[PDB]
Design a protein around this ligand. Structure first.
Ligand code: HEM
Ligand SMILES: *[C@@H]1O[C@H](CO)[C@@H](O[C@@H]2O[C@H](CO)[C@@H](O[C@H]3O[C@H](CO)[C@@H](O)[C@H](O)[C@@H]3O)[C@H](O)[C@H]2NC(C)=O)[C@H](O)[C@H]1NC(C)=O
Ligand SMILES: *[C@@H]1O[C@H](CO)[C@@H](O[C@@H]2O[C@H](CO)[C@@H](O[C@H]3O[C@H](CO)[C@@H](O)[C@H](O)[C@@H]3O)[C@H](O)[C@H]2NC(C)=O)[C@H](O)[C@H]1NC(C)=O
Ligand SMILES: *[C@@H]1O[C@H](CO)[C@@H](O[C@@H]2O[C@H](CO)[C@@H](O)[C@H](O)[C@H]2NC(C)=O)[C@H](O)[C@H]1NC(C)=O
Ligand SMILES: *[C@@H]1O[C@H](CO)[C@@H](O[C@H]2O[C@H](CO)[C@@H](O)[C@H](O)[C@H]2NC(C)=O)[C@H](O)[C@H]1NC(C)=O
Ligand SMILES: [Ca+2]
Length: 595
């Protein structure tokens, strides 16, 4: 087993070891090594980090140091020549609904977080980085290339701050830099409940004994709950419209209000928890507050694992699925459940799946109002469109009836994200998610594209010709070589995403390998995997299998018509059946009798 040797993060856990419930922090999953998988620990290294100075400085930090003999190209330049595109027509995925993209972001946030080095609300360098673009300490700005139109209109660079690492916050440490994962590595709904003791508590309704999550008191959605608002007044959600003055939502994960659809999904899960608590109180009038909380919780966690492994991964991994994820043989305590550093870049393939617009549909799945179709960028940190413009039902119908954006090698990331991204700490719509992804790739000391190809037993092109055959694209290969001068230097994020998709999947060979391995490990190394004998009863498990996102919509919204397979593309009304024709969740196996 493993756990630590330099650790400092959450204090003071002891453990029970007879407890049938996961801890909040992730500790004590593995009995041999209690900290394996816990939040606030280093992300795992499947390969040694690769920094300019070999310890902490990212490639591209020092102007005349090379990576294997060549200058690494500016992040924003790669964004401009390879990732961008203008024409949104013919870009949609004919067989993946908007929910496909959205579930990905959910699983993701449940698995990893690498927050920025924070270092003060007192600091002036938060504007020495912003206002002047001076590289230094944890300001590692994204410079604009010449001829970039943002030069003429936004300044000389885009703010950026290196991610946090273990040990500190301020200075530095001995050995090599390791970024922190602020959330638990186990699929366990930590995005609903929180990853800290702290926060998990603030989220609960501890005045009633019903094991419920606190809800909004200021507003309701046709009698259905909304997530509570957040405290911190320099609120970004208030900024995007100081007239509506509606603050961001407060959830188990801090990014829950990043974009209106992620908040919508968070809301659906909060509602499911409260609903499972009320019905559980019905079956067992004697269970106390803690017991109701933990049980509903345990439930929701299994639900997220079931939709993820049964409905989601097969249509991501395609025919590579069984090659990486075998059928389940049981808990294996030898497996390292930790999320690796590289996974957090591989799982970013989802950014190439976000379309440029979001729609609100009415009860008939017809355009909801005048302005029903909105540009994605006006929805970053937008909570007022939910509270002051229809509830979540409009938005949920769009999730089912619209499609995701299909990855394409000539159209990669939509301009709504590539030029108009809104960062919570700054004031403009005008950031580039693609460039940021690239800069972070380097901030985290990632090995290049060929190290990972090697790692996955895949060929390593060393020439233009070789790269063309792997990418099956002459022109993209030319653009990559002109910017990188050697495939060894291709940042893993762009390289992994530039590969053609595997059969029946939505990612290429490299990514399928990286994703497949990680997912096999968090299942196999999770003592509380829903299928691990003893976690649930066979009766509960039998009951556990009829879950479906569609059902979920039926019990928690006022939508009455849903598709049966929500992840594939579905046309209204042909594919939409009546909610009462959908398998329900039979709770009877949770009934406990004293004798
Ligand atoms: C706005 C953003 C999104 C949609 C409008 C969006 C979407 C996704 C999808 C669909 C993902 C996977 C299936 C996915 C994965 C990960 N993301 Fe995003 N994302 C939006 C915005 C961001 C921002 C901003 C970041 C931080 C970038 C940074 O480096 O500073 C971001 C991250 C991630 C992420 C890494 C998380 C971590 O481990 O720290 C993914 C796996 N997303 N996103
Ligand atoms: C749109 O996506 C669909 C799923 O990605 C795809 O159909 C899927 O086809 C597979 C076979 O290739 C089927 O899978 C299952 O088949 C048997 C059914 O008895 C099951 O017992 C197995 O477990 C196996 O998983 C499914 O029938 C089907 N999946 C879904 C969600 O419907 C469609 O073909 C795609 N549409 C187009 C036109 O490409
Ligand atoms: C900031 O948030 C405002 C909401 O607090 C928003 O204004 C609201 O949205 C429109 C304005 O275009 C109005 O909708 C329509 O309402 C009825 C239809 O039911 C009509 O009689 C009106 O003509 C109107 O078009 C909302 O009533 C309006 N609410 C308020 C208090 O003004 C702003 O548009 C938002 N601004 C930005 C920059 O996002
Ligand atoms: C905590 O849970 C209790 C219910 O157990 C909530 O109290 C109810 O609130 C609704 C709407 O305000 C009303 O039906 C009643 O006023 C309350 N019912 C009962 C039985 O007291 C309370 O609002 C919840 N608190 C939070 C912040 O979520
Ligand atoms: C549990 O996972 C371990 C660790 O991955 C598996 O170990 C096998 O493969 C390892 C390579 O990753 C090597 O350590 C060994 O070849 C082998 N170890 C053992 C225990 O034989 C292991 O197969 C899994 N456990 C079981 C019983 O399936
Ligand atoms: Ca988790």
């Amino acid at each position: 087993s493993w756990e630590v040797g330099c650790g400092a993060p959450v204090p003071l856990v002891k453990c029970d070891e007879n407890s049938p419930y996961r801890t909040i922090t992730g500790d004590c999953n593995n009995r041999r090594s209690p900290a394996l998988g816990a939040a606030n620990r280093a992300l795992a290294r499947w390969l040694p980090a690769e920094y300019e100075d070999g310890l902490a400085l990212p490639f591209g930090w020092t102007q005349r140091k090379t990576r294997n003999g060549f200058r690494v190209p500016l992040a924003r330049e790669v964004s401009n020549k390879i990732v961008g595109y203008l024409d949104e027509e013919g870009v949609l995925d004919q067989n993946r609904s908007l929910l496909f993209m959205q579930w990905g972001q959910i699983v993701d946030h449940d698995l990893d977080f690498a927050p920025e080095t924070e270092l003060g609300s007192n600091e002036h360098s938060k504007t020495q980085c912003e206002e002047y673009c001076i590289q230094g300490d944890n300001c590692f700005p994204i410079m604009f290339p010449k001829n970039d139109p943002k030069l003429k209109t936004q300044g000389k660079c885009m703010p950026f701050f290196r991610a946090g690492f273990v040990c500190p916050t301020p200075p530095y440490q001995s050995l090599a830099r390791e970024q922190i994962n602020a959330v638990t590595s186990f699929l366990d709904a930590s995005l609903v409940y929180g990853s800290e003791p702290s926060l998990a508590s603030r989220l609960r309704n501890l005045s009633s004994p019903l094991g419920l999550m606190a809800v909004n008191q200021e507003a309701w959605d046709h009698g259905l709950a909304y997530l509570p608002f957040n405290n911190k007044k320099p609120s970004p959600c208030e900024f995007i419209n100081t007239t509506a003055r509606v603050p961001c939502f407060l959830a188990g994960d801090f990014r829950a209000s990043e974009q209106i659809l992620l908040a919508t999904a968070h809301t659906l899960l909060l509602r499911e928890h409260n609903r499972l608590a009320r019905e559980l109180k019905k079956l067992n009038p004697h269970w106390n507050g803690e017991k109701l909380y933990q049980e509903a919780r345990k439930i929701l966690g299994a639900f997220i694992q079931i939709i993820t492994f049964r409905d989601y991964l097969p249509i991501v991994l395609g025919s590579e699925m069984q090659k990486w994820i075998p059928p389940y043989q049981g808990y294996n305590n030898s497996v390292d459940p930790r999320i690796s550093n590289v996974f957090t870049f591989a799982f970013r393939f989802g950014h190439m799946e976000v379309p440029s617009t979001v729609s609100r549909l009415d009860e008939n799945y017809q355009p909801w109002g005048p302005e029903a179709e909105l540009p994605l960028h006006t929805l970053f940190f937008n909570t007022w469109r939910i509270i002051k413009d229809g509830g979540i039902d409009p938005l949920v119908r769009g999730l089912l009836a619209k499609k995701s954006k299909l990855m394409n090698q000539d159209k990669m990331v939509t301009s709504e994200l590539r030029n108009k991204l809104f960062q919570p700490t700054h004031k403009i719509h005008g950031f580039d998610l693609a460039a940021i992804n690239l800069q972070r790739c380097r901030d985290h000391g990632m090995p290049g594209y060929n190290s990972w190809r090697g790692f996955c037993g895949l060929s390593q092109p060393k020439t233009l010709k070789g790269l063309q055959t792997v990418l099956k694209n002459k022109i993209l290969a030319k653009k990559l070589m002109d910017l990188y001068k050697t495939p060894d230097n291709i940042d893993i994020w762009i390289g992994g995403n530039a590969e053609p998709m595997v059969e029946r999947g939505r990612v290429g060979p490299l990514l399928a390998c990286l994703l497949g391995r990680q997912f096999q490990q968090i299942r196999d190394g999770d003592r509380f995997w829903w299928e691990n004998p003893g976690v649930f009863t066979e009766k509960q498990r039998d009951s556990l299998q009829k879950v479906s996102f569609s059902r979920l919509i039926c019990d928690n919204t006022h939508i009455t018509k849903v598709p049966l397979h929500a992840f594939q593309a579905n046309n209204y009304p042909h594919d939409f059946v009546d909610c009462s024709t959908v398998d329900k969740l039979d709770l009877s196996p949770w009934a406990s009798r004293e004798n």
